[PDB]
Scaffold this active site. Structure first.
Site, PDB file in Angstrom:
ATOM      1  N   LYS A 162      61.125  13.727  53.165  1.00  0.00           N
ATOM      2  CA  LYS A 162      60.170  12.990  52.344  1.00  0.00           C
ATOM      3  C   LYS A 162      59.679  13.837  51.178  1.00  0.00           C
ATOM      4  CE  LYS A 162      55.950  12.205  53.794  1.00  0.00           C
ATOM      5  NZ  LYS A 162      55.240  12.786  52.622  1.00  0.00           N
ATOM      6  N   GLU A 188      45.027  15.726  54.848  1.00  0.00           N
ATOM      7  CA  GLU A 188      46.319  16.340  55.093  1.00  0.00           C
ATOM      8  C   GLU A 188      46.139  17.678  55.794  1.00  0.00           C
ATOM      9  OE1 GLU A 188      48.834  14.811  54.950  1.00  0.00           O
ATOM     10  OE2 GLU A 188      50.563  16.158  54.890  1.00  0.00           O
ATOM     11  N   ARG A 189      47.113  18.025  56.626  1.00  0.00           N
ATOM     12  CA  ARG A 189      47.085  19.313  57.298  1.00  0.00           C
ATOM     13  C   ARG A 189      47.160  20.431  56.271  1.00  0.00           C
ATOM     14  NH1 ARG A 189      50.479  15.903  59.899  1.00  0.00           N
ATOM     15  NH2 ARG A 189      50.002  15.365  62.071  1.00  0.00           N
TER      16      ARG A 189
END
Lengths: 486, 50, 165, 130
Positions: A162, A188-189
């Site tokens: 992705k 988001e991480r």
């Protein structure tokens, strides 16, 4: 403007919700306030007004932790909504909700700032007609063409490349349309954000010593919900500047859009609002609308958004995705099965969709070719089952010609991306829209029925196919000639 | 909740059923292909039997 | 030359003071602390620094003042070599493997010396002659004493004679 | 009250005592009934928010110490045969041996209607048993 520097005092503190008392009157809603008292805090504290309790008291959401915060603590209004830097100086840089560079790479040195919250374009500013966005990828520009001012849902998790697709789109849009890109990491991480930044610097999309073509805006999980619910708007504001001032076709990536919905849901709960069905906030539709509507194609430029969607519990009827899908003008499905088949980009053409797949928008030839490709692929699936039932020889001449063309199509929809010119070693390709249409149109008719199947694997355009076929033929001839010697 | 899981158990059974029936399809597929030779080789033994 | 890190920031390349600190350590476990301290100071170790650390391990009395169970100098040095080879992209030179072989022969582990030999043969382009001979001296002395392998391994054991505890 | 009596026998008398309880769930149910009138917002399903802490304090008292030993046997009611319910689930971590009964087993004429695939024991280790 008249409330610039106005003074107030903290009146209540409950978690991330803080009530401020102003003797001169609360500033307008969505106004930004700074806590002057940094007695023991390791970071500055900023609040956003969300509600008015009375003529003097106002409720606000803290963008950071409210630790070491006392009542009656002094607070100063900033004179307006949150301000974010906008310009060409933000390229290649990382920002947060407050528009502060967190890359430790020196001052931004911007020349202007814009408010986070801006009204969406009026009905009179909308584009005269829909236009296609040539992404340079054969599959996307043929079977699910993107649209300027469009919102595209990139369904499919990681492990399918992705990030590579995102980087390729960023490079191609600037290469072809000369438009920049803004990436917004919502919830988001932190680890993945670091990896993405390193990859971008490795692919030169973010050139520290040169010119970058992408901005980053990260509101991470560890940040309180008040930040994750505004990071997207900050990134959107940056894109709006390029859309209006510079009149470009900008890109806005969101990772993910669900986290944005989740953050607003948490914020609404803290305020005490009654949740709606499945525990989501009553303002779910309005929250998304105030964001997506700002993403459109105007008379000056356009902003095409590629939003990564997540379906909770694999339930496509859940209010979050269901409300989100109503704003999407295209879908891109990434599947591991296709990637395990060696097809990169790993896109399932039959699972994708687009609304501009209509002759009234795209050229008639484009529409006819795309539908023919879809029909052939669908027929190829049924023939796979039939040959499994009995065998290949059991199919008709007609059907056996269709099982050969389809396999060539599947191989021809793969493409080598220039972003991977380093880690994969193969020169990338940027196939034009017209070239792709002609190449597929010729293939469907049967002109290229003599070319070997593998000549279509990881190539761009039709000329590349011919060149690969010639090289394969030359290699085969040399090997046969060497064998005859021995 | 039990009511929710009652459906989940019910759907769990249907999943195994699909797999087993899928296995039957393959077993019969092999025997169908093996017995498909008769189609080619029939229609000549019984001539004077007629 | 003006080396940079993952994120493109400049790095300190003056490792001489840290090497001197390493040479002062008595127990080689303390040497690891120096490597940690210089890493925090944005002064990553060089090939010389690792070689100095290996020298301290070989020349140190023990890991710590207090004895540590199952402590092994050979394992520590090999782990250090792995760290510099994989997590730092530094190729060990002849000196690094030379220290390893010296430890193996000194410790009497003649079999590990055989493996280090072939590593030196194929990587360092040459193994010191004295160490090779001194390693075989242990092997032939061990063969004379009958202790080529642990005794319990050479004992015959049938199907039901194996005690798995 | 009963637990206090057993504790005295354990500590003062130094004896090995048995403690049978039937049913421990009613202790949780009773506190839920009064929780509404104490101005406490109900938690999920409808139990009191203090379900885990109140049960924990009681269960920790039911233990064998260096002075004596208490062998405790407690009967837990699984409302509507839903073992995912907060009360039965919260009690699983406070036990050394769980015996889970199933209605389907009983309907087949098998008594005791134990489902061995769901039961567990801490002493099911070769070191303890043969």
């Amino acid at each position: 403007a008249d409330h610039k520097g106005r003074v107030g005092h903290v009146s209540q503190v409950i978690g991330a919700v803080v009530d401020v008392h102003f003797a001169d009157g609360v500033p307008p809603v969505l106004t930004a306030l700074d806590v002057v008292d940094k007695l023991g805090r390791d970071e500055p504290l900023t609040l956003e007004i969300v509600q008015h309790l009375d003529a003097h008291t106002g409720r606000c959401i803290a963008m950071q932790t409210t630790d070491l915060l006392k009542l009656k603590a002094k607070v100063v209004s900033t004179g307006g909504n949150i301000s974010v830097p906008v310009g060409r100086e933000t390229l290649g840089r990382i920002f947060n909700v407050l528009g502060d560079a967190i890359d430790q790479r020196g001052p931004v040195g911007e020349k202007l700032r814009m408010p986070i919250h801006a009204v969406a374009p009026k009905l009179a500013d909308q584009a005269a007609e829909d236009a296609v966005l040539t992404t340079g990828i054969k599959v996307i520009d043929l079977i699910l063409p993107y649209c300027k001012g469009g919102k595209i849902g990139l369904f499919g998790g990681a492990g399918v490349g992705k990030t590579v697709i995102i980087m390729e789109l960023i490079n191609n849009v600037a290469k072809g349309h000369g438009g920049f890109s803004v990436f917004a990491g919502v919830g988001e991480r932190t680890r993945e954000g670091t990896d993405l930044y390193l990859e971008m610097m490795q692919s030169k999309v973010i050139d520290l010593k040169g010119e970058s073509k992408c901005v980053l805006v990260y509101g991470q999980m560890n940040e309180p919900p008040g930040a994750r619910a505004r990071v997207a708007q900050s990134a959107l504001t940056m894109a709006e500047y390029f859309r209006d001032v510079e009149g470009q076709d900008v890109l806005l990536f969101i990772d993910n859009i669900f986290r944005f919905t989740q953050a607003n849901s948490e914020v609404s709960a803290l305020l005490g609002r009654i949740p709606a069905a499945v525990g989501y906030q009553p303002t779910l539709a309005e929250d998304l609308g105030q964001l997506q509507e700002r993403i459109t194609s105007t008379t000056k430029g356009s902003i095409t958004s590629v939003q990564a969607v997540y379906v909770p519990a694999d339930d496509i009827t859940d209010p979050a995705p269901a409300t989100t899908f109503s704003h999407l003008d295209a879908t891109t499905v990434l599947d591991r099965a296709v990637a395990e088949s060696g097809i990169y980009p790993a896109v399932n053409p039959l699972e994708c969709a687009s609304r501009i797949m209509d002759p009234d928008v795209i050229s008639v030839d484009h529409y006819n070719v795309a539908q023919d490709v879809v029909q052939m692929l669908t027929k190829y699936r049924e023939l796979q089952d039939i040959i499994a039932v009995l065998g290949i020889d059991e199919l008709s001449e007609e059907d056996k010609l269709i099982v050969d063309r389809a396999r060539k199509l599947v191989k021809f929809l793969s493409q080598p991306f220039q972003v991977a010119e380093v880690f994969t070693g193969m020169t990338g390709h940027y196939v034009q829209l017209d070239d792709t249409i002609d190449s597929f149109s010729g293939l469907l008719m049967g002109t290229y029925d003599q070319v070997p199947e593998m000549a279509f694997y990881m190539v761009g355009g039709i000329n590349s196919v011919l060149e690969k076929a010639k090289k394969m033929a030359e290699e085969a001839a040399e090997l046969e000639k060497m064998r005859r010697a021995r | 909740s039990g009511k929710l899981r009652l459906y989940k158990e019910k759907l769990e059974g249907y999943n195994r059923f699909y797999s087993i029936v899928k296995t039957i399809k393959m077993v019969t597929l092999a025997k169908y292909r093996a017995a498909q030779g008769r189609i080619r080789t029939r229609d000549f033994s019984l001539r004077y039997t007629e | 030359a003006k080396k940079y890190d993952l994120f493109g920031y400049e790095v300190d390349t003056n490792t001489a003071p840290w090497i001197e600190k390493i040479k002062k350590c008595k127990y080689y476990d303390e040497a690891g602390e120096v490597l940690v301290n210089m890493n925090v100071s944005n002064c990553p170790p060089d090939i010389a620094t690792y070689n100095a650390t290996l020298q301290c391990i070989y020349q140190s009395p023990s890991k710590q003042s207090t004895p540590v169970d199952n402590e092994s100098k050979f394992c520590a040095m090999m782990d250090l070599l792995e760290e510099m080879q994989h997590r730092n992209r530094l190729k060990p030179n002849e000196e690094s493997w030379t220290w390893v072989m010296k430890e193996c022969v000194k410790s009497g582990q003649f079999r590990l010396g055989y493996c280090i030999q072939q590593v030196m043969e194929t990587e360092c382009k040459g193994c010191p002659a004295d160490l090779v001979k001194a390693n075989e001296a242990n092997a032939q002395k061990a063969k004379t004493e009958g202790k080529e392998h642990p005794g319990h391994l050479s004992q015959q054991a049938g199907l039901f004679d194996v005690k798995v505890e």
